[PDB]
Tab-separated table of C-alpha atoms and ligand atoms in Angstrom:
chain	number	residue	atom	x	y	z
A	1	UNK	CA	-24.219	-9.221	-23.708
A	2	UNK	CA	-22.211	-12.231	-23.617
A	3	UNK	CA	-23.012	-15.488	-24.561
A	4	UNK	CA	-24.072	-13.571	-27.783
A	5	UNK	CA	-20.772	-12.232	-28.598
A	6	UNK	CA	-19.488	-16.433	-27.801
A	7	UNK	CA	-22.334	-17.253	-30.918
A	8	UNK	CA	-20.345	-14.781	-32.986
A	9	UNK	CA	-17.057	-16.187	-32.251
A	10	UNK	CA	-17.944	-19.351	-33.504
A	11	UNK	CA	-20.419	-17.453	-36.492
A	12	UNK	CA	-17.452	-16.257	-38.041
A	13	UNK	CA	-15.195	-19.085	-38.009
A	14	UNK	CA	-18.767	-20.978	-39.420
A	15	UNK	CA	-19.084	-18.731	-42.144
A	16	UNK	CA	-15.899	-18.734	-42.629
A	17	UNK	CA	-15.234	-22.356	-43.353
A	18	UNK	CA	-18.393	-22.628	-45.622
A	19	UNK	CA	-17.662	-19.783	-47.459
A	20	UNK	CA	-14.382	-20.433	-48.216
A	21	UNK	CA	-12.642	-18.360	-51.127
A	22	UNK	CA	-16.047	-16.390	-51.861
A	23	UNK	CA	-16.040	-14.413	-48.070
A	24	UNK	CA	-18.686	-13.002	-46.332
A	25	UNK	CA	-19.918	-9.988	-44.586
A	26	UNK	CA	-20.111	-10.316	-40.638
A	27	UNK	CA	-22.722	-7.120	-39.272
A	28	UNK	CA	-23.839	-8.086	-35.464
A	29	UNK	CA	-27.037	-6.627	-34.025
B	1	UNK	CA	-29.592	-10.254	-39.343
B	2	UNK	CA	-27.336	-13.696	-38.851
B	3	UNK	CA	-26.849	-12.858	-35.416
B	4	UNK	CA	-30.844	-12.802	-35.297
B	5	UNK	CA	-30.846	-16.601	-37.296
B	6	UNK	CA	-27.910	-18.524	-36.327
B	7	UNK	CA	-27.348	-17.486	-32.791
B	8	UNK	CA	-31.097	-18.416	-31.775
B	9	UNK	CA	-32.132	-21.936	-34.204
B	10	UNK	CA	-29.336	-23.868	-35.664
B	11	UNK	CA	-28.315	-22.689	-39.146
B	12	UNK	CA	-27.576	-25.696	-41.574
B	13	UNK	CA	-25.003	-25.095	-43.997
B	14	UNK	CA	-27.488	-23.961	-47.031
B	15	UNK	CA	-28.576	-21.304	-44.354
B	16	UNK	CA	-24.778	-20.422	-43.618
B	17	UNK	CA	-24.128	-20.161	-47.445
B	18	UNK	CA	-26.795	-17.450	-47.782
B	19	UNK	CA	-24.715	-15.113	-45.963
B	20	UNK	CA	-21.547	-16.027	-48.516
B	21	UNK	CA	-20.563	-13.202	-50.874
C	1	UNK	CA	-1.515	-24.131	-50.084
C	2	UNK	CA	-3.223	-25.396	-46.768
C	3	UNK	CA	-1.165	-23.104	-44.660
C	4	UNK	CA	-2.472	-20.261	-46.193
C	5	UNK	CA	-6.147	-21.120	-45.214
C	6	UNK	CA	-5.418	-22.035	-41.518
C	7	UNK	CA	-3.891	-18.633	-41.317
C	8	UNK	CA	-7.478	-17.064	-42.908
C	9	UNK	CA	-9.261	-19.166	-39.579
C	10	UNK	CA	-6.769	-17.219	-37.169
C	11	UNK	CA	-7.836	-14.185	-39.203
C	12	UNK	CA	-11.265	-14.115	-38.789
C	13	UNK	CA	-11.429	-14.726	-35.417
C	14	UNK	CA	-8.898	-11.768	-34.901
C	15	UNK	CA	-11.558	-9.538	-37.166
C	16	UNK	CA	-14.429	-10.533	-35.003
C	17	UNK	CA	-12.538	-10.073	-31.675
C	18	UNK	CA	-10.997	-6.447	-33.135
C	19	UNK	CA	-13.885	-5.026	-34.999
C	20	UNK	CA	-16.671	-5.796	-32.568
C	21	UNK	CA	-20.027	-4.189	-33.128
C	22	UNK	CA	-18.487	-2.747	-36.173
C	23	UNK	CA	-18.034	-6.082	-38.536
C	24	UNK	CA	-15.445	-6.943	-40.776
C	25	UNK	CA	-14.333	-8.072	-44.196
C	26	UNK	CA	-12.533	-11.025	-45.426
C	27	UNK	CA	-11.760	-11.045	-48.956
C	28	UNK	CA	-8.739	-13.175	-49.906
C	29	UNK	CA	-9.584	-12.692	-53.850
D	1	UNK	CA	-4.498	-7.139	-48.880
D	2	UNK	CA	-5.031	-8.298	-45.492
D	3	UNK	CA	-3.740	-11.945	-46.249
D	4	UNK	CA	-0.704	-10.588	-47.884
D	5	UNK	CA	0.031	-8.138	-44.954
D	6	UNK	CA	-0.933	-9.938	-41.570
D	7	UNK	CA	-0.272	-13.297	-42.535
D	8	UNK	CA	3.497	-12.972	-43.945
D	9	UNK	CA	3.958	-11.088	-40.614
D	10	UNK	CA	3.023	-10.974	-37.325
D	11	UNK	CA	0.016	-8.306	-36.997
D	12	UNK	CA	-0.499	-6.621	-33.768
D	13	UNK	CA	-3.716	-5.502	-32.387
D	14	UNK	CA	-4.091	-2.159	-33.998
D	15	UNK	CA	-3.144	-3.760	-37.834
D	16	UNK	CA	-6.346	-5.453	-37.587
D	17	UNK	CA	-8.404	-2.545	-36.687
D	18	UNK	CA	-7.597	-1.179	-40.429
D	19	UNK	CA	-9.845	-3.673	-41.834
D	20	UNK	CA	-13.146	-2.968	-39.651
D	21	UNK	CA	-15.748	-1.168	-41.387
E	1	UNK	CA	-30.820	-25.890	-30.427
E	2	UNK	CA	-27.843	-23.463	-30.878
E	3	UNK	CA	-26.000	-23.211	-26.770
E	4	UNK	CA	-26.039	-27.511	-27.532
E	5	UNK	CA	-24.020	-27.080	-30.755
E	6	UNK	CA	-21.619	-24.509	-29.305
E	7	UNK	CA	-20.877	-26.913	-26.771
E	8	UNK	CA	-19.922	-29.217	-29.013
E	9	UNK	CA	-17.599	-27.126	-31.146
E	10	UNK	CA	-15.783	-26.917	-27.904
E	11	UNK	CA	-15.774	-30.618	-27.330
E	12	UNK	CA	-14.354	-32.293	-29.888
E	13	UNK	CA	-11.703	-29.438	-29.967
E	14	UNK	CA	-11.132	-30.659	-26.785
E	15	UNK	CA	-11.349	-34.378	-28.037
E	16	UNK	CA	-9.132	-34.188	-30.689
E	17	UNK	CA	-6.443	-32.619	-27.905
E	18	UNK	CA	-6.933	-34.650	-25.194
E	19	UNK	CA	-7.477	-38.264	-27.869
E	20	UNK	CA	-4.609	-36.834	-30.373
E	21	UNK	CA	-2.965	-40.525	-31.613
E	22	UNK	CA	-5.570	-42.004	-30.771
E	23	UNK	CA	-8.558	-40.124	-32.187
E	24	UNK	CA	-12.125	-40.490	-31.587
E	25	UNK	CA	-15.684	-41.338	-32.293
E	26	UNK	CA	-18.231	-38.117	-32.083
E	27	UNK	CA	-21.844	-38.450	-32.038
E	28	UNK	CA	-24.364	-35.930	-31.082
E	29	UNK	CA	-27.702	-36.589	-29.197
F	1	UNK	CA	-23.764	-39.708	-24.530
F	2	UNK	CA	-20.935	-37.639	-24.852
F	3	UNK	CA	-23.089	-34.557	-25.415
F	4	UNK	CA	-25.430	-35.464	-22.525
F	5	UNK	CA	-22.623	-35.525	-19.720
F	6	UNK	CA	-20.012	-33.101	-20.914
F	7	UNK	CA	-22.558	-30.402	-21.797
F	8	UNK	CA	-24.346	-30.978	-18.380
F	9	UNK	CA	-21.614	-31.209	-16.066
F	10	UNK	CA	-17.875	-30.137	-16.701
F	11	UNK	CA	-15.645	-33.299	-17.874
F	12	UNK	CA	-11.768	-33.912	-16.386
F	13	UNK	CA	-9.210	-34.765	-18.336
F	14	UNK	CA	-9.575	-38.400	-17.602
F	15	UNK	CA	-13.466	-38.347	-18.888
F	16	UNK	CA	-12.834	-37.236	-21.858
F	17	UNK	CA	-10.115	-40.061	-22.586
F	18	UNK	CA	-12.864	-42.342	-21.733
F	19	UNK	CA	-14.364	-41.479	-25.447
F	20	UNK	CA	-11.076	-41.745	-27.161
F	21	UNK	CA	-10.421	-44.941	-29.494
G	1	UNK	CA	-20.219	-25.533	-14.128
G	2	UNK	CA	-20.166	-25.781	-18.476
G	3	UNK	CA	-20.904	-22.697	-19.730
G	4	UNK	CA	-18.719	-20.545	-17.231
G	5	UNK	CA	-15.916	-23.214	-18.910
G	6	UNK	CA	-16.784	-22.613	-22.410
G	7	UNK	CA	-16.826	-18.658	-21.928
G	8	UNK	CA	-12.927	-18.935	-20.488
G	9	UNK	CA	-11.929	-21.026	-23.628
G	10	UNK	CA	-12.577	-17.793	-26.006
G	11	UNK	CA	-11.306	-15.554	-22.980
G	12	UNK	CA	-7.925	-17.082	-23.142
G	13	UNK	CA	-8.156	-17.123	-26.785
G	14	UNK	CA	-9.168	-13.235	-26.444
G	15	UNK	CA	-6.751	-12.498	-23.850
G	16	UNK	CA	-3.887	-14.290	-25.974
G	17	UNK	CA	-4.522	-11.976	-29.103
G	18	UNK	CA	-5.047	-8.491	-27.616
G	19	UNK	CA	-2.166	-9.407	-25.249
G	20	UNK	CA	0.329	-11.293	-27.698
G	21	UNK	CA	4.163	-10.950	-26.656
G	22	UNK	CA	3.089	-9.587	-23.265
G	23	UNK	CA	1.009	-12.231	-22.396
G	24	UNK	CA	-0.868	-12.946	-19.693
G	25	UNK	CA	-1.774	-14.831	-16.290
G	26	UNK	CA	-5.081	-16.429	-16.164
G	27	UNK	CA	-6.893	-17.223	-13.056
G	28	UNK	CA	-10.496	-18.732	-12.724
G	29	UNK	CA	-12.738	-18.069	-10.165
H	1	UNK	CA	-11.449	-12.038	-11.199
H	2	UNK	CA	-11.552	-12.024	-15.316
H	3	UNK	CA	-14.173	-14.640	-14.955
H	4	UNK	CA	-16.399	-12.611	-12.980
H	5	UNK	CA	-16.487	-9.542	-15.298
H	6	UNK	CA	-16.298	-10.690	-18.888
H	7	UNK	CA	-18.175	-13.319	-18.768
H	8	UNK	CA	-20.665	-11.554	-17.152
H	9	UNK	CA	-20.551	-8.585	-19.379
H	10	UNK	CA	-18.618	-7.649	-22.562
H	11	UNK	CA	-15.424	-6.770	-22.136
H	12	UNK	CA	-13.490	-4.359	-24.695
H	13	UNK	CA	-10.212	-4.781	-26.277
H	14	UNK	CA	-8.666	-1.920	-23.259
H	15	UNK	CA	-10.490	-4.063	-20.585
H	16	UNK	CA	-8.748	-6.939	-21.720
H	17	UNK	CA	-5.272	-5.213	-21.992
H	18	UNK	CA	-5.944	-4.889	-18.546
H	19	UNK	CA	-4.957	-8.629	-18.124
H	20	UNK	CA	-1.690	-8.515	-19.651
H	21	UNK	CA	1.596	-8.847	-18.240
I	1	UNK	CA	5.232	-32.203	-37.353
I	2	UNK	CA	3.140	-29.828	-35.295
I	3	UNK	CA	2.303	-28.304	-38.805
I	4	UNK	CA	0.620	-31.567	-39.188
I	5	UNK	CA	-1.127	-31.341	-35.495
I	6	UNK	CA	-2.660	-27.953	-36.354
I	7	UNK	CA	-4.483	-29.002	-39.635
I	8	UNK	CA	-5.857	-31.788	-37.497
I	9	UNK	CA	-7.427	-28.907	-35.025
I	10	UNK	CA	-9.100	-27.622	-37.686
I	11	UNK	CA	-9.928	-30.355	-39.808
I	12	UNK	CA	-11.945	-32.016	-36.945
I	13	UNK	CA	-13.713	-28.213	-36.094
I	14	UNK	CA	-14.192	-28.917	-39.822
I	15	UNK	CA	-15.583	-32.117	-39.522
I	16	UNK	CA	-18.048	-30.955	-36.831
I	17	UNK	CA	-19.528	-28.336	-38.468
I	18	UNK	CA	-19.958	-30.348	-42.095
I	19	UNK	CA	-21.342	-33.998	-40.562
I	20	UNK	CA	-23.294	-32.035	-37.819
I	21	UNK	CA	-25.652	-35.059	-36.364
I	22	UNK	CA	-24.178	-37.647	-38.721
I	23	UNK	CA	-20.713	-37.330	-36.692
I	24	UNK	CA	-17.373	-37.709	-37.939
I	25	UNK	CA	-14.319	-39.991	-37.224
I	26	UNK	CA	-11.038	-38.645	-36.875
I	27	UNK	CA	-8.286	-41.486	-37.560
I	28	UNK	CA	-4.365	-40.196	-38.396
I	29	UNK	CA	-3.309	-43.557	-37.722
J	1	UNK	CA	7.059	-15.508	-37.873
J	2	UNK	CA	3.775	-16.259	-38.474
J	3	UNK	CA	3.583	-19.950	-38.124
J	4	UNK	CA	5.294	-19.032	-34.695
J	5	UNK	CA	1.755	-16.800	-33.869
J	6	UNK	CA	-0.321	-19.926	-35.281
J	7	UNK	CA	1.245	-22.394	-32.803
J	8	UNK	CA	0.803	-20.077	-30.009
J	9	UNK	CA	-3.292	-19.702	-30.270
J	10	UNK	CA	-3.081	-23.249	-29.946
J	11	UNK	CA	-1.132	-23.583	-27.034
J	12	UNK	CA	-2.892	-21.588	-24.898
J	13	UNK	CA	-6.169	-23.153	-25.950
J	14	UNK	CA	-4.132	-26.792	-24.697
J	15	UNK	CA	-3.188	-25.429	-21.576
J	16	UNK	CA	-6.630	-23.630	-20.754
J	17	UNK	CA	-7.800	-27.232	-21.703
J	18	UNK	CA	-4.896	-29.436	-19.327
J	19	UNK	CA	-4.303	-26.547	-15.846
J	20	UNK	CA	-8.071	-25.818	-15.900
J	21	UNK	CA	-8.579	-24.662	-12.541
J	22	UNK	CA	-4.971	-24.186	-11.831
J	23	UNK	CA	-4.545	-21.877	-14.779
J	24	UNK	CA	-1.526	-21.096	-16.747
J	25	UNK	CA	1.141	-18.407	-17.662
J	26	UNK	CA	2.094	-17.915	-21.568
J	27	UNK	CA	5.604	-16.407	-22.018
J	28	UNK	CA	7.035	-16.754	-25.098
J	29	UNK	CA	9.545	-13.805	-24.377
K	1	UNK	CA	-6.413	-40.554	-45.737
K	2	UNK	CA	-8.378	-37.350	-44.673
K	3	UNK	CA	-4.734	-35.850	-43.405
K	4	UNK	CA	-2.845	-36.730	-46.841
K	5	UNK	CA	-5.945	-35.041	-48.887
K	6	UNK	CA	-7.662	-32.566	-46.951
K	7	UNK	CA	-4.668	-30.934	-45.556
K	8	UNK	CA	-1.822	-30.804	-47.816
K	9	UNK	CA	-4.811	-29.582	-50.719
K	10	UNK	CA	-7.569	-26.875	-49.435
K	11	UNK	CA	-10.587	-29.026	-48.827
K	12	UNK	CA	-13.892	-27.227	-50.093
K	13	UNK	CA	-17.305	-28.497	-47.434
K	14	UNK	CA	-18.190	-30.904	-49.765
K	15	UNK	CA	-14.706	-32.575	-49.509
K	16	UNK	CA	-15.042	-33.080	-45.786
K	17	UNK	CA	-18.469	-34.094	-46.669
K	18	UNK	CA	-16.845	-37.879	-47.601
K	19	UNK	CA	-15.776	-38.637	-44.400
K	20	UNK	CA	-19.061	-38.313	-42.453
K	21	UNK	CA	-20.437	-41.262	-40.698
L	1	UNK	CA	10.738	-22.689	-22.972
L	2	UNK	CA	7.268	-24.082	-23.699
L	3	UNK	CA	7.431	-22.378	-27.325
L	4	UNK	CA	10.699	-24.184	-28.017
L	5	UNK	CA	9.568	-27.557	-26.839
L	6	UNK	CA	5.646	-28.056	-27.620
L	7	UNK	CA	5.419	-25.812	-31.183
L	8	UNK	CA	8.540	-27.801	-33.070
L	9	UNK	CA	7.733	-31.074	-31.709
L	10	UNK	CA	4.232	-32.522	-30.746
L	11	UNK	CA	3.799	-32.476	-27.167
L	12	UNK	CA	1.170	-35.255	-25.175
L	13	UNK	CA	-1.224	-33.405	-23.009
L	14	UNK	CA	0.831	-34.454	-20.094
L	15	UNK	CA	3.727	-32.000	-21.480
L	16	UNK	CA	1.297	-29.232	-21.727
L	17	UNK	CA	0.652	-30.498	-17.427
L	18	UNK	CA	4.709	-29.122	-17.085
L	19	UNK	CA	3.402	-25.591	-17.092
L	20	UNK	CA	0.424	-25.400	-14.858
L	21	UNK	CA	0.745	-23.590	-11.885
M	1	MYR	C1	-27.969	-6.481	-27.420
M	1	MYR	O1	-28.417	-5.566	-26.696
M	1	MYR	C2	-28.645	-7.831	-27.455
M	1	MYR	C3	-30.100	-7.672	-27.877
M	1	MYR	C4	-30.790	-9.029	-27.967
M	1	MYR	C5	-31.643	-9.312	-26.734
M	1	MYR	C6	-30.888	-10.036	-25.622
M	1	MYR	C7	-31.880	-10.733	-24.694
M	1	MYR	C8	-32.957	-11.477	-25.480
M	1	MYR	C9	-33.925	-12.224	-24.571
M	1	MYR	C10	-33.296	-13.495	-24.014
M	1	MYR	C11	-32.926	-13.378	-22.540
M	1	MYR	C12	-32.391	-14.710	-22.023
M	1	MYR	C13	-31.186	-14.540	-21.105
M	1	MYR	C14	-31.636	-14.231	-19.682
M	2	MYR	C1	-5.399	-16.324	-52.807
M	2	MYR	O1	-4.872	-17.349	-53.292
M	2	MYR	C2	-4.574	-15.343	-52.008
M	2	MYR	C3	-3.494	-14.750	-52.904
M	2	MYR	C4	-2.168	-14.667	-52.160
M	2	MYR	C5	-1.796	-16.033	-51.596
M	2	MYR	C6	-0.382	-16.032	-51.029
M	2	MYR	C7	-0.036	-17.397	-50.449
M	2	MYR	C8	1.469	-17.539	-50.249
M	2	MYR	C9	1.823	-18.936	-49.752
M	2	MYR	C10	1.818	-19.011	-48.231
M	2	MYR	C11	3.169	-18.584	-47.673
M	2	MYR	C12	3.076	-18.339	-46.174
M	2	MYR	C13	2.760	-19.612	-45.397
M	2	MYR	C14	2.488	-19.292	-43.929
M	3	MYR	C1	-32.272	-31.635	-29.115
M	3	MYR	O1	-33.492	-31.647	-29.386
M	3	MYR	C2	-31.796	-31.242	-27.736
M	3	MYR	C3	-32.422	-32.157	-26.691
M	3	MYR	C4	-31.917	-31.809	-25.294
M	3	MYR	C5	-32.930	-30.971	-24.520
M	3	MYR	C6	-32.745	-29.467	-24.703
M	3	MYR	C7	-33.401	-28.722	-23.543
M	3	MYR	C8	-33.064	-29.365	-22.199
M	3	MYR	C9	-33.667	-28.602	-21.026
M	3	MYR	C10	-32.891	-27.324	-20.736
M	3	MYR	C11	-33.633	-26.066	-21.172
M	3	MYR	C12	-32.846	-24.823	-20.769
M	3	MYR	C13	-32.846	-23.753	-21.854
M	3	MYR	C14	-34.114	-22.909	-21.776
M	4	MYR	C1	-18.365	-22.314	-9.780
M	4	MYR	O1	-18.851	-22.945	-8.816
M	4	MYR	C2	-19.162	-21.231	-10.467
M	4	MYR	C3	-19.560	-20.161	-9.458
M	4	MYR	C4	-20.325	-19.031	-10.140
M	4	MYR	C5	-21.830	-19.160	-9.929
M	4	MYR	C6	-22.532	-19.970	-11.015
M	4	MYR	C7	-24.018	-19.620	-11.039
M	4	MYR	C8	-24.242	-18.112	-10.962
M	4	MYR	C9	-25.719	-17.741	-11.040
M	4	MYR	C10	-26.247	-17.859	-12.464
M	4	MYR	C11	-27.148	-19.073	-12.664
M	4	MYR	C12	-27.716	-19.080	-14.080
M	4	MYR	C13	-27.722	-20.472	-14.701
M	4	MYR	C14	-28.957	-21.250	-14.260
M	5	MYR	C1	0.736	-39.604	-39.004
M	5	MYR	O1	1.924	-39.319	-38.738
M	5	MYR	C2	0.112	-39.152	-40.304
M	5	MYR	C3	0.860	-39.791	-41.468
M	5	MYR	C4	1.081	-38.778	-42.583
M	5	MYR	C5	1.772	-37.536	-42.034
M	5	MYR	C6	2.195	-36.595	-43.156
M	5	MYR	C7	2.863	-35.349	-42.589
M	5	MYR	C8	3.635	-34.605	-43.672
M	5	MYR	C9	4.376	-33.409	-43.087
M	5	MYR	C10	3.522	-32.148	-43.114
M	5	MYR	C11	3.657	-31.443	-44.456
M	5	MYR	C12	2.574	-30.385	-44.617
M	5	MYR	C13	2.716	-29.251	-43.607
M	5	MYR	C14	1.511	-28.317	-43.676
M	6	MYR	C1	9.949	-15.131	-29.717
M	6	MYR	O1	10.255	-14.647	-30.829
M	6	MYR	C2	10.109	-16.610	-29.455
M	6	MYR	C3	11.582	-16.983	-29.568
M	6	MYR	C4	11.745	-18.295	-30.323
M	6	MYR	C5	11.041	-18.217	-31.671
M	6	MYR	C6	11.360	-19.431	-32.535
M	6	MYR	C7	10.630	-19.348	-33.869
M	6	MYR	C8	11.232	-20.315	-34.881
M	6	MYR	C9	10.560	-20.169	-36.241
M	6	MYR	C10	9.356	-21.092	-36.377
M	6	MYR	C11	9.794	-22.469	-36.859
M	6	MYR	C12	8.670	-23.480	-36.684
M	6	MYR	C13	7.465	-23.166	-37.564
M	6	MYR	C14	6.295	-24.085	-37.221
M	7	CL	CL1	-19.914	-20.551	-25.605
M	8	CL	CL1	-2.523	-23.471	-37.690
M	9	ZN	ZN1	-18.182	-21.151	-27.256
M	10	ZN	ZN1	-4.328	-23.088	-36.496
């Protein structure tokens, strides 16, 4: 589907300014 | 999952910082 | 150095695109 | 790491698939 | 709502291009 | 606002200036 | 239409990475 | 066009190759 | 310096995500 | 070059931004 | 300025935190 | 080319306009 995998482009970049120098894990659905 | 969360209510930065390592 | 973490942004979003269902890992340190 | 490898130098497509899980 | 705040990620990337110099003022609904 | 005609409809080039400073 | 505009901002972003020096031509509908 | 099929339906990294020059 | 005009790309997708309703202002100059 | 790659995921997101319907070719090489 | 602090130094969230309306 | 005019010096949105189609 696609307008979920457009939420995930910008879910990453999210979590990926907030969590900064710790990282994160990124699992979809 | 986050996917499950974030991608169907808005996710406020505490919520975001859950998913930090 | 700033340059460094605008290059992490572009990573990301080249880990989501790449890895897909999958997921990915960022881990600077 | 993957900073030290695909951000001192351009990274094609493939490079990136080494980090999926 | 999330599809609003997408939107908006969009926009004032699109702002901040389109205003460069000049900048801008952002506020959501 | 800016959220309640560029989300709506799509803007031109020319509407978004309209919100620059 | 918005979200049909939103979806060809990460397509070009998308088609820019997997393409790189190739490139690419993009046409909307 | 590419609008009409990935943004109707995922596309994968070879469907998208498929737009490159 | 387009160095300079790329930090501002992501310092305002920054800005967005941190202020959220609040809002931001974005002022170089 | 990396900062060359950097600058290029921002130009393409400009001119998806300024052709819009017109659309736009990317050739660096 | 935010451009002379937050991006010649990495900003952490609560730095761009300060220059919220 | 539009890599050796608009990514080493800052280029207006009407130089990004040059390379519509
Ligand atoms: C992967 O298969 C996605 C699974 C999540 C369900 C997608 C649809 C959820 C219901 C919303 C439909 C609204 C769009 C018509
Ligand atoms: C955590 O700090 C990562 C450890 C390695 C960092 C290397 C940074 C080198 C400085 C950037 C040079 C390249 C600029 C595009
Ligand atoms: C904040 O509360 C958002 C207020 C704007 C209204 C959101 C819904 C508008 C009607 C569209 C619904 C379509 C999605 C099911
Ligand atoms: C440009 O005019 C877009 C043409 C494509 C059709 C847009 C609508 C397609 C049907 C989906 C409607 C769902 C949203 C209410
Ligand atoms: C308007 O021109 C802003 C005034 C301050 C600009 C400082 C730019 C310094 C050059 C960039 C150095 C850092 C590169 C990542
Ligand atoms: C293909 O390789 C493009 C040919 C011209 C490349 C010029 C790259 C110059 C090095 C970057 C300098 C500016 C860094 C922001
Ligand atoms: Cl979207
Ligand atoms: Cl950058
Ligand atoms: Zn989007
Ligand atoms: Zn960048």
């Amino acid at each position: 589907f696609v307008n979920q995998h457009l939420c995930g482009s910008h879910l990453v970049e999210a979590l990926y300014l907030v969590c900064g120098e710790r990282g994160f894990f990124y699992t979809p659905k | 999952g986050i996917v499950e969360q974030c991608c169907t209510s808005i996710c406020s930065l505490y919520q975001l910082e859950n998913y930090c390592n």
